[PDB]
């Protein structure tokens, strides 16, 4: 059935139909376009008119232009042949390697798995990153979120996770580039070809790529996360095998929605957001999950506007996670990388019954010493260190060493640090912090602990800083 | 031809025309008023109806009332015969001295001078005011703005500049009162009659006055700046002459625009302001300028709402200035007058290649010690100066002497200071601060540097005490 | 030396305590004006978005 455009304002296009009205979520095809222009039905306005969101630019559209109902929501290629390829929001190849030679397709809108479909299994996923493994460990098949303001380290961390966890992964990975830098998509693509994770000449590729970056209009940015997760859902349910899903950046899904909200005729909620922020997020997030059929370990970069973690977008995201890594500009600004806030990062599996009492005790001990120092800092900035008991100033010096031993040079960050990348086994992470807490390095200079891997390197650095 | 009023809300009057529609910016004349009531066309609404802004009160207006198109924007008298006269927003004499019989009139809307007309000449204008001359000096033909919250010293400073600058000046001056105190206009007028810069008997007056004060409805407050500028533009272009333009207070222009925008039914921007705040400001400000054809040294007082320099009005004004003098309530309350913030006042000519390396180095030296002092303020607030190290106590003590030496008795504020006004030559300003920075006066008490002119007066003052 | 030190610490710590007290008032009043303004500004943004519709 056929309609005609009646209004165009930015990404929002109104289309009138004389006969059969297309249901909400249906994909509509604009006629007379050089490249495929999809409109997704968002509302029935009445008077046989639907309001839509465009998946690409609306420049050149005319009132009266023909629009065809496809009879379904956006459907994209799924299956083995997505591996090694790059797709856009509507499933077209954007790697100039010709058609996605698949004969299996899936709608990007789908129901979330039911309560009966949930899995309660939770085992540690060691990352080799000291701060994460010690304080707020990731779980295999769990939901991981990386929070941060602009420029504090979300992408560097996700790239390091890809390096330490995904490069040696036995199953499939999906990376979804959502409203981020096209330059980062190109960096990643060529890095994966170099690492062999993507292979252009054979069928051994282990990663499927999906991109709709910040050069795209909001419709594309609003739906590209669903496209990427639809690919992942196939691998979870139809191949069964363990899937890793990386999303950078899932905030961009909510932001895209806020860009079009007023033009969809909604009264704003607080801070300019769509009234539907939480239910929109819920319908999307509840699909990003391990089920009884298959495991998805999901790692989502989550942007924090104006550095305010109370911003409705990140605030609403927390409840959807099993482990949260919260980055901080106040920490990054000191040169402490990765810029993880040790006092604002949590994990479901940080439990003495799960990680063992030794791991738990050292992690809680570390958090106590850091919180104790943080609560003293401002008092001693005025009254002076000299006013402290030898007990308090001992915990100040120790806390400052622990802060530094939490920093780590990343393999993916060598161009920023000037230091070789380091991966630290969980056992060594635990041991190192245990020793610092016990006062076993009270004699060593603060700086020996900064930007090293294992504790032995701090000892070695102490000798080097002498002469 | 003629139109009829269809709607009135405050300053906003809608008018329907049956034969021919007046263009935007056209001045309309309301028929049957005891005093001339001009409406300025702002928008075409559709259905042969224009939305207009009134230049005076709209009480007594009735729907169906007749309105005539004058066929032009507001036009005012320009030229020699404006000198010594006072006019309102629509160019009428308000001094009870009869017609202003100029040979020319000019519309109050004119396009800003184009890029090709700009002058790049940069030359110091010495004020004799220590803070300004040292840290953020004014330029001849440059744009000067004086920022301040309520009662901090904007008008005293502009009056002192009229005293210090507008006599060593051999051209013409224009003063525009915009949304300020009517009695301040009365004060200035009669002072100028007394001094002789306005002569009521001969053609020797050198100043033209234009006023639309805080008793006026917003359309008048919004346009009276353009009236003043237009008078300035004539002398700049048609006489080519060196012109001084003083405006107290340009904020009132933007505030007036906010009042009308509320009535024009626009969607508001941040802090309830008109969405057009920046372009409105731009279209007006860009006319306040020196060109290759003639020089305008402009000094504008800029009110700061609730002392907040991030308020859209003052915030947007910074980029239009070549020199800023930013006043501070906290500094005023410490008794430092003029209450200039030495770390928030800037000038484009503060450049070693323009003022010389000596001037430049002394200025940067002063701002360094003052910032170093400022950076210690958290600890001093709690614990006092005594808890500081030897080195820090030296910088604090030198900075406090510098702070005090930046204060100055103004001729205009003698009643409030109890000190005779002082004008300090530039080289003496440089020398005095140079000497303090070098530690030549470490032995002299702070208070000796307070409310004096040259450094010698601080020495003589210190000799008196102990 | 100590009798002078103990009395000078008395004087200094009394004066510090007074200053702290005066700063607490200043900051509390800054806190509250900011608390109120944040609520007011957020509400005006909402009202403005709502009025701009249909």
């Amino acid at each position: 059935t056929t309609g005609r455009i009646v209004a165009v304002i930015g990404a929002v296009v109104d289309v009138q139909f004389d006969e059969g009205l297309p249901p909400i979520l249906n994909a509509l095809e604009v006629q007379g376009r050089e490249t495929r222009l999809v409109l997704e039905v968002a509302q029935h306005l009445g008077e046989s008119t639907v309001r839509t969101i465009a998946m690409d630019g609306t420049e050149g559209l005319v009132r009266g232009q023909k629009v065809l109902d496809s009879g379904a929501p956006i459907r994209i290629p799924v299956g083995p042949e997505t591996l090694g390829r790059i797709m856009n929001v509507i499933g077209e190849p954007i790697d100039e390697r010709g058609p996605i030679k698949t004969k299996q397709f899936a709608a990007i809108h789908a129901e979330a798995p039911e309560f009966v479909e949930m899995s309660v299994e939770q085992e540690i996923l060691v990352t080799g990153i000291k701060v994460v493994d010690l304080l707020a460990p990731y779980a295999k098949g769990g939901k991981i979120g990386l929070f941060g303001g602009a420029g504090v380290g979300k992408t560097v961390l996700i790239m390091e996770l890809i390096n330490n966890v995904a490069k040696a992964h036995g199953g499939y990975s999906v990376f979804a580039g959502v409203g981020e830098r096209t330059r980062e998509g190109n960096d990643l693509y060529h890095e994966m070809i170099e690492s062999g994770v993507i292979n252009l000449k054979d069928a051994t590729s282990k990663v499927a790529l999906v991109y709709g970056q910040m050069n795209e209009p909001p419709g594309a940015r609003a739906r590209v996360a669903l496209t990427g997760l639809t690919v992942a859902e196939y691998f979870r349910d139809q191949e069964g095998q363990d899937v890793l899903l990386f999303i950078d950046n899932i905030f961009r899904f909510t932001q895209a929605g806020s860009e079009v909200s007023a033009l969809l005729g909604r009264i704003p909620s607080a801070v300019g957001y769509q009234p539907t922020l939480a239910t929109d997020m819920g319908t999307m997030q509840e699909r990003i999950t391990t089920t009884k059929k298959g495991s998805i370990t999901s790692v989502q970069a989550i942007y924090v506007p104006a550095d305010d973690l109370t911003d409705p977008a990140p605030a609403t995201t927390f409840a959807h996670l099993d482990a949260t890594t919260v980055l901080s500009r106040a920490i990054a600004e000191l040169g402490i990388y990765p810029a993880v806030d040790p006092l604002d990062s949590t994990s479901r599996i940080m439990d003495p019954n799960i990680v063992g009492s030794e791991h738990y005790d050292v992690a809680r001990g570390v958090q106590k010493i850091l919180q104790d120092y943080k609560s003293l800092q401002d008092i001693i900035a005025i009254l002076g260190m000299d006013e402290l008991s030898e007990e308090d100033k001992l915990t100040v010096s120790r806390a400052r060493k622990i802060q530094r031993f939490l920093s780590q040079p990343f393999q993916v960050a060598e161009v920023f640090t000037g230091h070789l990348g380091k991966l630290v086994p969980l056992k060594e992470t635990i041991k190192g912090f245990q020793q610092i807490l016990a006062g076993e390095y009270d004699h060593l200079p603060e700086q020996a602990f900064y930007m090293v891997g294992p504790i032995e390197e701090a000892v070695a650095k102490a000798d080097k800083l002498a002469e | 031809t003629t139109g009829r009023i269809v709607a009135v809300i405050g300053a906003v009057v809608d008018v329907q025309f049956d034969e021919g529609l007046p263009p935007i910016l056209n001045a309309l004349e309301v028929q049957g008023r005891e005093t001339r009531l001009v409406l300025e066309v702002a928008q075409h609404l559709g259905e042969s109806t224009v939305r207009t802004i009134a230049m005076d009160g709209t009480e007594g207006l009735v729907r169906g009332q007749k309105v005539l198109d004058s066929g032009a924007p507001i036009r005012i008298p320009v030229g020699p015969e404006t000198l010594g006269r006072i006019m309102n927003v629509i160019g009428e004499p308000i001094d009870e001295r009869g017609p202003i019989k100029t040979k020319q009139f000019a519309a109050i809307h004119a396009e800003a001078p184009e890029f090709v007309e700009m002058s790049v000449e940069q030359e110091i204008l010495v004020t004799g005011i220590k803070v300004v001359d040292l840290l953020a000096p004014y330029a001849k033909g440059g744009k000067i703005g004086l920022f301040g919250g309520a009662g901090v010293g904007k008008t005293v400073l502009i009056m002192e500049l009229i005293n210090n600058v507008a006599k060593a000046h051999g051209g013409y001056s224009v003063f525009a009162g915009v949304g300020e105190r009517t009695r301040e206009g009365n004060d200035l007028y009669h002072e100028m009659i007394e001094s002789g810069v306005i002569n009521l008997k001969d053609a020797t007056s050198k100043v033209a006055l234009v006023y639309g004060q805080m008793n006026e409805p917003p359309g008048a407050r919004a346009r009276v700046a353009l009236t003043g500028l237009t008078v300035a533009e004539y002398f700049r272009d048609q006489e080519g002459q060196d012109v001084l333009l003083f405006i107290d207070n340009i904020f009132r222009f933007t505030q007036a625009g906010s009042e009308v925008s509320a009535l024009l039914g626009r969607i508001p921007s941040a802090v309830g302001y008109q969405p057009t705040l920046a372009t409105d400001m731009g279209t007006m400000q860009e006319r306040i300028t020196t060109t290759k054809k003639g020089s305008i040294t402009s000094v504008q007082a800029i009110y700061v709402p609730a002392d907040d320099l991030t308020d859209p009005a003052p915030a947007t004004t910074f980029a239009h200035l070549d020199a800023t003098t930013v006043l501070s309530r906290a500094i005023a309350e410490l008794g430092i007058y003029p209450a200039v913030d030495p770390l928030d006042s800037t000038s484009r000519i503060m450049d070693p290649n323009i003022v010389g390396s000596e001037h430049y180095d002394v200025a940067r030296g002063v701002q360094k010690i003052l910032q170093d002092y400022k950076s210690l303020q958290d600890i001093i607030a709690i614990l006092g100066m005594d808890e500081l190290s030897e080195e820090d106590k030296l910088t604090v003590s030198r900075a406090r002497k510098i702070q005090r030496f930046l204060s100055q008795p103004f001729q205009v504020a003698e009643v409030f200071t109890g000190h005779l006004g002082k004008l300090v030559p530039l080289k003496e300003t440089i020398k005095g601060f140079q000497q303090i920075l070098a530690g030549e006066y470490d032995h002299l008490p702070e208070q000796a540097f307070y409310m004096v002119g040259p450094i010698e007066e601080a020495v003589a003052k210190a000799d008196k005490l102990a | 030396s100590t009798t002078s030190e103990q009395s000078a610490r008395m004087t200094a710590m009394d004066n510090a305590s007074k200053n702290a007290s005066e700063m607490i008032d200043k900051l509390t009043l800054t806190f509250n004006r900011t608390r109120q303004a944040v609520i007011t500004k957020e509400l005006i943004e909402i009202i403005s978005g709502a009025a701009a519709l249909d």
């Binding site: - | 006092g384 005594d386 | 100590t2 510090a16």
Partner: peptide, 26 residues
């Protein structure tokens, strides 16, 4: 021989600075 007396503890205004190869008080 001088040799300068104060104490170990600060927060006493100018006590140390007013008096200031041995010296008693840290």
């Amino acid at each position: 021989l001088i040799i300068g007396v104060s104490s170990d503890r600060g927060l006493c205004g100018a006590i140390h600075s007013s008096v200031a190869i041995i010296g008693v008080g840290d």
